[PDB]
Amino acid sequence: PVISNFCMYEFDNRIHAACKKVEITYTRYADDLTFSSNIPDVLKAVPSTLEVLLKDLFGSALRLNHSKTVFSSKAHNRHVTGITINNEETLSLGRDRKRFIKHLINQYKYGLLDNEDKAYLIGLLAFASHIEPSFITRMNEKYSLELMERLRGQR
Amino acid sequence: MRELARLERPEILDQYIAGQNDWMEIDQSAVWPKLTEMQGGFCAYCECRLNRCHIEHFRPRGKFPALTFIWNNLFGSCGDSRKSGGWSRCGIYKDNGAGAYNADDLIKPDEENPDDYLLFLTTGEVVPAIGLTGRALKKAQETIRVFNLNGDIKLFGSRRTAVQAIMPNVEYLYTLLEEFDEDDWNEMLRDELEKIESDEYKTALKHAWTF
Amino acid sequence: MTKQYERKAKGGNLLSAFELYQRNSDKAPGLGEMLVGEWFEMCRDYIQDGHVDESGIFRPDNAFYLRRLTLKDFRRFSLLEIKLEEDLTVIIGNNGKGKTSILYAIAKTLSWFVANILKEGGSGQRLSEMTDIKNDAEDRYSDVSSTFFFGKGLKSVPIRLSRSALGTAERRDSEVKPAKDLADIWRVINEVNTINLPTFALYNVERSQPFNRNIKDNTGRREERFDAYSQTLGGAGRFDHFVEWYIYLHKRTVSDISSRVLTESVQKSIVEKAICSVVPSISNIWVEMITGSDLVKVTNDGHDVTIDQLSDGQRVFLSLVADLARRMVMLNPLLENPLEGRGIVLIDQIELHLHPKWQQEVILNLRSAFPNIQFIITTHSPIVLSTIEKRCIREFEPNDDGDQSFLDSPDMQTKGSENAQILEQVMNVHSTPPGIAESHWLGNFELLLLDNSGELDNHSQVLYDQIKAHFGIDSIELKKADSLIRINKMKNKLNKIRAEKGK
RNA sequence: UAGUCGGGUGAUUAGCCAGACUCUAACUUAUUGAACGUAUU
Numbered sequence A: 001p002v003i004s005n006f007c008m009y010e011f012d013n014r015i016h017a018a019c020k021k022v023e024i025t026y027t028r029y030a031d032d033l034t035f036s037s038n039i040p041d042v043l044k045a046v047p048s049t050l051e052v053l054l055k056d057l058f059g060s061a062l063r064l065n066h067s068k069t070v071f072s073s074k075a076h077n078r079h080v081t082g083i084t085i086n087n088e089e090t091l092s093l094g095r096d097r098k099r100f101i102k103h104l105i106n107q108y109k110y111g112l113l114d115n116e117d118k119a120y121l122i123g124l125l126a127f128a129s130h131i132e133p134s135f136i137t138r139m140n141e142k143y144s145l146e147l148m149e150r151l152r153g154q155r
Numbered sequence B: 001m002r003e004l005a006r007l008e009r010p011e012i013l014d015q016y017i018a019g020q021n022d023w024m025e026i027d028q029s030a031v032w033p034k035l036t037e038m039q040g041g042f043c044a045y046c047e048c049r050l051n052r053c054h055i056e057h058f059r060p061r062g063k064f065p066a067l068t069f070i071w072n073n074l075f076g077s078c079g080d081s082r083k084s085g086g087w088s089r090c091g092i093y094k095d096n097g098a099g100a101y102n103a104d105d106l107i108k109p110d111e112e113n114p115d116d117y118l119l120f121l122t123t124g125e126v127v128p129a130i131g132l133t134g135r136a137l138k139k140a141q142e143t144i145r146v147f148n149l150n151g152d153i154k155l156f157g158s159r160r161t162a163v164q165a166i167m168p169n170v171e172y173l174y175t176l177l178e179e180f181d182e183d184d185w186n187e188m189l190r191d192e193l194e195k196i197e198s199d200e201y202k203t204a205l206k207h208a209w210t211f
Numbered sequence C: 001m002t003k004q005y006e007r008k009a010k011g012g013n014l015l016s017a018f019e020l021y022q023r024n025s026d027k028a029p030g031l032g033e034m035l036v037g038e039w040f041e042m043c044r045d046y047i048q049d050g051h052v053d054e055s056g057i058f059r060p061d062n063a064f065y066l067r068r069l070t071l072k073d074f075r076r077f078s079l080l081e082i083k084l085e086e087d088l089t090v091i092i093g094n095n096g097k098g099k100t101s102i103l104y105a106i107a108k109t110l111s112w113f114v115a116n117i118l119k120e121g122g123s124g125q126r127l128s129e130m131t132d133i134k135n136d137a138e139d140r141y142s143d144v145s146s147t148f149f150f151g152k153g154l155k156s157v158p159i160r161l162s163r164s165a166l167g168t169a170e171r172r173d174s175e176v177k178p179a180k181d182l183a184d185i186w187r188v189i190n191e192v193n194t195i196n197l198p199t200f201a202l203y204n205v206e207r208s209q210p211f212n213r214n215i216k217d218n219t220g221r222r223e224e225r226f227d228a229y230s231q232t233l234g235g236a237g238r239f240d241h242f243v244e245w246y247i248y249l250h251k252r253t254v255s256d257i258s259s260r261v262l263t264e265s266v267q268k269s270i271v272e273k274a275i276c277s278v279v280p281s282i283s284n285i286w287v288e289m290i291t292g293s294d295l296v297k298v299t300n301d302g303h304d305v306t307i308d309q310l311s312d313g314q315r316v317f318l319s320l321v322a323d324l325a326r327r328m329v330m331l332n333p334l335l336e337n338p339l340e341g342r343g344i345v346l347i348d349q350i351e352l353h354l355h356p357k358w359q360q361e362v363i364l365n366l367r368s369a370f371p372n373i374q375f376i377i378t379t380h381s382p383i384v385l386s387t388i389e390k391r392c393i394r395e396f397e398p399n400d401d402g403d404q405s406f407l408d409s410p411d412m413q414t415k416g417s418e419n420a421q422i423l424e425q426v427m428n429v430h431s432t433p434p435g436i437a438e439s440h441w442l443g444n445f446e447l448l449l450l451d452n453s454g455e456l457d458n459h460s461q462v463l464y465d466q467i468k469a470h471f472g473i474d475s476i477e478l479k480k481a482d483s484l485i486r487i488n489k490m491k492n493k494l495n496k497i498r499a500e501k502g503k
Numbered sequence D: 001u002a003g004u005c006g007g008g009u010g011a012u013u014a015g016c017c018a019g020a021c022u023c024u025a026a027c028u029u030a031u032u033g034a035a036c037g038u039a040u041u
């Protein structure tokens, strides 16, 4: 991990320098470059810059995956490395995963959840508390605080 | 083309200095309101309704960087390079397509009169005005070639079918000169002329109606 | 593990459900089953579910179509991207712009689906290392990436076909595993319980070859269901196979007397109705067995004629429609209307050999006969475009060198528009030829009347006489010429009554 | 209109209700390793 992070220090530096001037923010989760901007029609020129910079730096060894270059906007689904970005500009787990968690909690309410799926739900609710804290409060309202306390951590 | 009248220079233009500050820095949303009053949402070179539009510099910044932040060299032209390059007409064609032109050989709609330098035939083709000789004819031909007024089929065909769309109207109005008295026919001509102001091609239709 | 697959499958994931089914099946008397009755039933219901909409057409719940195509260093394209529509996509442009290249790439991609439907681990067609790599590319390899949609449970099926140039040390592999997985799902589910299979067809320029009934020992069995995939992406649909299949159907129908009703008669009737409805001139088709070689006869404009006496244009279109109808009928046995099955059909130059009268209705007839088929079509005609929505058109700029990233739709609505307008705007072609000197005569006239003062003189009268002699009296050109004459004689009597009072 | 976002109800991954968005334009992915959250500690 650290070797791969260092091998793209110059790539990250050049991309960030050339990308912040056009008002585009750039990140990389070590294999997955993310660009976003509030200015329309400026991201369409980024993949060519990425390709030419990769050729300049790594030659032919490192290259983009042209089948994995995805454009998106508020008209479509928006998720960055597993977290859905709402139309309200807030982080979320997505409607489908939040309904899945609701189904799991409802199953636990009636004692239809075995040990393995109970552990999976406690793990997923820890992750949900990390990503979307308001979901925990909403589930406390929906499924009562006592039931959530019995499932989640008690000490 | 159509005559363009100016107003006060926008207050954000003088806040920037040519040379030190590049053009891609400026905020266009503010230079545009002033380029919309002057043009009425129509191109300054072909009189097409501006659905895809960009700020055009009459003197290119590459050759003449000095006139980069000067309300007089600014213009509103159709097409958009930011929305992909599918435009062989007007400003984009002047900067990219035609090439090998002199800026003093192109009529400026800002100051020079386009009516006496260009004639719009009802067949949809613009030709230099009758009786033009010397530098005026050369300027008209250079403008027509560089701005591609005759050229890409999209503009020529749209302008032609715009002019021939009102040919029955022109025939019907002008065939009733003897039926109507001078004042009523005169006011009908004004009524017809002032409602083509909102129409797309300002001067092609105007040439077809008037005198 | 098992539980992750169960969580995904109960959420609607087709791949996870199939993985669970295959695993649980493996244990024959162990955990799982034969129709796993949870996992196999969910897979088959995913493939087979659908409802009849308000118009009477069956619509699958999870449609199958091609979403996106990326071409990297393929023929003339450095990097091209297309966003094909679900129902109809029409690619237009000049000659040598790459429409046939796009259809060829899509067909090469679909050949893997066909091959893995036919056989387990079957190998489809591959890109050529002699002509498909861009000649002036630096990398010396080409890619053809595709993404397929098969409902919400399988939203992306990425497949990439790659080939390195001849004499290159480093070779490039093809990522064809997801297509193999989807076709494995189709084939395995079909084996246990018959399901409707997709139809993949390519109709290139390679069609329209002469047709003689020279196919007797043709080796293969045309009744066999999986014969509908034989040479289905070669470019020329097997019309001889259709003739043999039709004669087989006729023999089985005339030699016969779950409901004691022959399904061969139903198939024959469906194909007959499709052929008669799509092809304009053909009204009825049958098989004659007296004069005891088998012959197929059609009614062309009220005259009973044989299948080899059709013209080039009524025989090519008939071959296309008949082949498509046969394959759809054979691949969709459980559908009430087999032509409502899903699939992808590529047609190159749909207006081939067709009169302008036939071009006004070919698209509508094809889409009415096959409503769930994704048609990807190229054309050289404004008449075909006038019957097609603007959003379905992907145009090539007239000054493209292959370095365009994304193909787009025109800015002008083409449906219901006049042919001259579509020619001028969409196709970038003058309505009146520019190379003919007689085409500039009306404009050259105007000038003469304006070079003077709206008034006829010697040379303007000479030009008007020339226009009279060439175009004629009833021609529109003379109508506009005399309209201009009358008008300019009128705006000058006006000018007269004005300058006189203006001094 | 689609498509997307997701606040609520719903023995609950489904169905429904309310609200909202629309650069030509998401497709939800990977461990035991790395880091993050959580629990023992």
Ligand SMILES: Nc1ncnc2c1ncn2[C@@H]1O[C@H](COP(=O)(O)OP(=O)(O)O)[C@@H](O)[C@H]1O
Pocket: C074, C075, C076, C093, C094, C095, C096, C097, C098, C099, C100, C101, C102, C131, C132, C133, C134, C135, C136, C378
């Ligand atoms: N390997 C290649 N390198 C470069 N150009 C190619 C290559 N293969 C084909 N072309 C070009 O691509 C075009 C192919 O035409 P085609 O795809 O059939 O277009 P259309 O459907 O418009 O007739 C031609 O203009 C040809 O010169």
Ligand SMILES: [Zn+2]
Pocket: B043, B044, B045, B046, B047, B048, B077, B078, B089, B090, B091
């Ligand atoms: Zn213009």
